[PDB]
Amino acid sequence: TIFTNLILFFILLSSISLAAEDPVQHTSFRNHILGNADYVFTSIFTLEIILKMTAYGRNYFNILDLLVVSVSLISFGIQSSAINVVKILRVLRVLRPLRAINRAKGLKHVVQCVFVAIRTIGNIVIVTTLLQFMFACIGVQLFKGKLYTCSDSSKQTEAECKGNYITYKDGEVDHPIIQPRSWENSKFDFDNVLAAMMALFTVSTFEGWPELLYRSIDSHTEDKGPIYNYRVEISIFFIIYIIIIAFFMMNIFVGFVIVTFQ
Amino acid sequence: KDMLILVDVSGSVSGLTLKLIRTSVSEMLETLSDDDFVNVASFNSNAQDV
Amino acid sequence: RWNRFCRRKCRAAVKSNVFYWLVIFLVFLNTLTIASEHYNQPNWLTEVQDTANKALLALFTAEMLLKMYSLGLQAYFVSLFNRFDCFVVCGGILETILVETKIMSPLGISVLRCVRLLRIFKITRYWNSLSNLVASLLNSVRSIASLLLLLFLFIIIFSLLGMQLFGGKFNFDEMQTRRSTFDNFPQSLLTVFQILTGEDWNSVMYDGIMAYGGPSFPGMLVCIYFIILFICGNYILLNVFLAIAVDNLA
Amino acid sequence: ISIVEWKPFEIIILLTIFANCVALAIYIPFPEDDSNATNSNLERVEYLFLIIFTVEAFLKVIAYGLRNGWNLLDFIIVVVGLFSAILEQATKDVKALRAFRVLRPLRLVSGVPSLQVVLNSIIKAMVPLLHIALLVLFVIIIYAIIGLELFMGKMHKTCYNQEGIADVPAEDDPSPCALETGHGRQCQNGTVCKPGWDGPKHGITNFDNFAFAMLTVFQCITMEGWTDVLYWVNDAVGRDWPWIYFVTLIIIGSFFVLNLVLGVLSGEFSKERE
Amino acid sequence: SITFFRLFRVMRLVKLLSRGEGIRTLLWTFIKSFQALPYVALLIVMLFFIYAVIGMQVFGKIALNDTTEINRNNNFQTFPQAVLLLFRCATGEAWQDIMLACMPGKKCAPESETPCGSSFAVFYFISFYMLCAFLIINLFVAVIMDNFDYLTRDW
Amino acid sequence: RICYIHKASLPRATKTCVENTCYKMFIRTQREYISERGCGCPTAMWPYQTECCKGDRCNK
C-alpha cells in the first residue's frame, strides 16, 4: 500500500494547498507560492494514470481521476477569453479531495451507504417536495401581489407612493429627515409558484417566518398597502404548514432512517 | 372658532399613542390665531383640565 | 334489462388501461392550468386558465359517473382515496355559488386533486407502503388526536399564562410596534407558537425582562417562564411528532 | 351526599371548567388599568365560576374525608380563588392570583381518561431522560464559570461621538469597542469610546454574574442567537480565541446533547413497541 | 497566560459530574460508539471543505460592509472564516440573509481589480443546507444504532 | 422608443423596443444597482422588483 500512501499524502496536501489560498486578491505571494505550487502535484498525479493505464485498456473512479487531472491539464492553457472558462475550472478544482474516496477503503463503504439511504428516502423527499408545490399553489391564490408596501405608511398605492416624505429619527419630531418614497415588495413574496416555493422553504427552516406571518396578516387587497391586523385568521395557513411539513414530514424522515437502520 | 380639545388619557393610550396624541394636540394649537379661544381637557374616568 | 352494451363498456372501459393513462394526462393538465399563474398575468393566460377550469371539471365529473356504475356504489364508496376525489369533484361543482363574491377565490381545491397524480406513483416501488403509511396514520388516528390535543392544551395554558403575565406590558416609548406581544388570545397563541419552535425565542424574552422592570433580582426572574416553555414544548413536540412517526412507520 | 358524585356532577363540572377557560380567553388585558365592559362582566362571571367550585369542594371533603392528586390541585386553585376574591373586594395582588386560572384547565384535562393516559405515557418516557438532563445542567455550569473567568465585564465600552458625552451615538446598534492598545472594534475615525455602558442588549446578555452567564450559555446552546453573542465577545476581546468557546459549546452541548436525547427516546419507543 | 491557568478547576467540576454510574455508562458507551465510526465524520468534513472552497472562490470578493450580512466577522475572505460562515448556516442563523447578501450587484473590495456577486447563491445556500442536514442526520443515526444494543437493555 | 434590453445584467447592452413604458428591474433590497432597464412592464422573478414609467428612458 506504499503507492496508495504515496498519494493519500500528496492529494490531501494539494487539497490543503488549494484551501489556504488568497480569496480576495488576484495578485499576491500566497497565490504565487500556491500559484506555482501545483506543478509537482499535477505531473505526479498525471503520471499515476500513465503507470496504470498500460496495465489495462474503463472503471468508474478512473473517469473521475481523468477529469480531475484534465482540469489542470486544460486550465494551464485555455488563454483567449480569460474572464470565463478559467473562472469555472478554477472552481472545478474542488474535485481533488474526491479522488481520495477511491484510493481509501471504507470511504467507498460509507459513500455507498449514504447513496443507498438516498435510495430509501427518495420517496419521502418526493412527497415533501410535492407537498411544497401544493402549498405554494394554494398560497399563490392567497397572497398574490398583496404583500406590497410603501416606505411611507400613509400611502397605499404604487402611484401614490412616489416622491419624498419626512422621516423622524427615533420618533423625535424635532429631527426631520427627507427620504424618498419606494414601493417595495416583501423579501419573500408569493407572486408566483417558484417564489412561494422558496418562501415556504424558508418557513420550514424556522428562519424569518414571523416576519412573513406578520406581513401576510396585514395584506388585504392586491396592489395595495398593508392594514394593521386586517386578517388574523390567515395565520392558520402558516400553522398548518408548519405542523404538516416542518414537523410531520421531517420527523417521518428521521423515523424512516431510524427504523431502517434498526 | 371656539375649539375645546378633549384628550383621552386612559390606560390604553400609553406608549406610541400618547406620543402622537401629545404631538398632534401641539400642532393643532398652531392653527389658531388670536381671534380664537381654546382650552384643553382630558378624561381618564374623571374630566379635568390639563 | 338491456345493458348488453353498457356494463361491458363500463368496467372494461374505465379500467381499460388507456382510460387511466389518459386520466393521468388530464390531471397533469389541471395542475399545469392552476400552476401557470402569477401576479400581473397576461390577458391570454387569464382567459385560458379560466376557460379550461370547467372544461376539465365537466370531463372529471363525467368520469365520476362512468366509474360509478362500473364498480357500483359499495365498491366505489369503500375506497378511501375514491372519497377524496369525491370531495374534490363535489367542491368543484359547489364553488359556483361562492364564485359570486370570491370569498375562497378560485379555491385551492384544484390542487388537492394532484393526490390522484399518485396514481402514477401507484405502480412505483414501495407504493404499497405509502398506502400503508396513511393506513397506519389513520388507524392510530385516535391516539394521534389525543396526543395532538394534549399538546394543544399545553399551548393554550402557556398562552393564557403568557397573556396574564405580559398582557399590555410590551408598551415602551420606543418607536416600533413589535408584533410578538401578548395582547389578545390569537397574538398570544402566535407568540407562544413562535417561542416553541425556537425562532426568535430570545427576542421575546428580552422584551419580557425589560417589561417587568429590568435586569435585577425580582425583574430578571420572568425568564423562567420562557425557559420552561421552551424545554417542555420541545420535549412534548419530540414525544408527539417522533412517537407518531416511529410507531406508525415501523 | 356521596350519591350526587355520579355522572351529572362530573359533566357539569367539566362544562364549568371549559366555560372558565373560554372566559379567560376573552378577558383581554389592557395597558395600565384600562378596561372595557367585557372585562367588567367577566369579573362578575368569575364569581359564579368560583361559587360552583366552592360548592363542589365543600361536599367532597365531608364526603370523602385532598390526597387524590388532581383533587389537591383543585383544592389549591379553589382556596387561591377565594383568597383572591376577598383581597380584590377589600382592596379595590391581581397579577399574582389571576395566574392560577391557568392551573384550572389542568384540573379540566385531568378528567378525561384518554388524556390522562397520554400524560402518564409522556411522564413515563421522561424518566430515562434525567441523566441527559443532569449532564445538560452540568455543562451550563462548567461553561458559565469559564465565561466568568474569560469575559467578566469586558464588554462595557462603546463609541460615544467625541464632542460631548451625549448618549452612545454610534449607528442604531451599539456594539462594543476597544482602547486601541486593546484588541476589539476600534471606532477608528474620531469617536473616542469610554466605559460606563449598560451592555450589548440592555444588559441582559453579558458575562457579569453567575446568572447573566447562566442564560447567555443557554441561548448559545439552543443555537438561537449564538453568533450575535460571538460577535459581541469577538469585537470586544479580539478575534483569536473566542471561537474555541462558542463552537466547542455547540459541538459538545447542542449536538452531543440532541444526539443522546434522540437515542434514548428512540430506544424507549422501540422497547415500548416490542 | 494567566487567563488560561485560572481555568483548570472546571475540570475537577467535570470529574464531579463524571461521578455516577448512569452518567459514566451512557457517556462511555456513546464515546466508544463515536470512535467506532470515524469514517462518518469524514463526510461532513469533506462537505464543509468542498463548499468552503466553492463559496470562497465564487461568492467571496465583496467589501466588508457592516450594514449587510457580510462584515469583518462574517465573510468568505479566508478559509477559517468561510468555514465559520458555513457552520453558522448549518446551525441555521441567518442563512437567507447571507444568501441575499451574496446576490449579484454588490460592490467588491477596492483592493481587488458593481459586477461582483453571483446568482449561484440560491443553489449554494439551499443545497448546502439540505446536504448538511442529511449528513448530520446520517451521523446521528449511525452512532445511535451502533449503541442501540445498550439503549434497549431491560436492566 | 429606446431603452437598453439585455439578458446578461452586467454588460448592459442596448436593444430596440416599441412599448411606451420603460421599466426598471432591481433587487428588493439592493435597489441602488439597476439590474435591467428596458421597455414594457414585465413581471419580476425572484429576487427582483419592477417599476414602470410613462415615457422613454424615464427610468434613471
Ligand SMILES: CC(C)CCC[C@@H](C)[C@H]1CC[C@H]2[C@@H]3CC=C4C[C@@H](O)CC[C@]4(C)[C@H]3CC[C@]12C
Ligand atoms: C411557567 C410556570 C409553569 C412556572 C414558572 C412560574 C413563573 C411564571 C413565575 C415564577 C417566579 C415569578 C416571578 C417572581 C417575582 C417577581 C417579581 C415581581 O416584582 C414581579 C413578578 C415576578 C417577576 C414573578 C413573575 C412570575 C414568575 C416568573
Ligand SMILES: CC(C)CCC[C@@H](C)[C@H]1CC[C@H]2[C@@H]3CC=C4C[C@@H](O)CC[C@]4(C)[C@H]3CC[C@]12C
Ligand atoms: C403557572 C402556574 C405554575 C401557577 C401560577 C404561579 C405563578 C405564575 C404565580 C403564583 C404566585 C405569583 C406571585 C405571588 C406574589 C407576587 C407579588 C407581587 O407584588 C408581584 C407578583 C408576584 C411575584 C406573583 C407573580 C406570579 C406568581 C409567581
Ligand SMILES: *[C@@H]1O[C@H](CO)[C@@H](O)[C@H](O)[C@H]1NC(C)=O
Ligand atoms: C457600504 O458602506 C458605506 C459606508 O459605511 C455605506 O455608505 C454604504 O451604504 C454601504 N453599502 C452597502 C451596499 O452596504
Ligand SMILES: [Ca+2]
Ligand atoms: Ca381606553
Ligand SMILES: [Ca+2]
Ligand atoms: Ca433563528
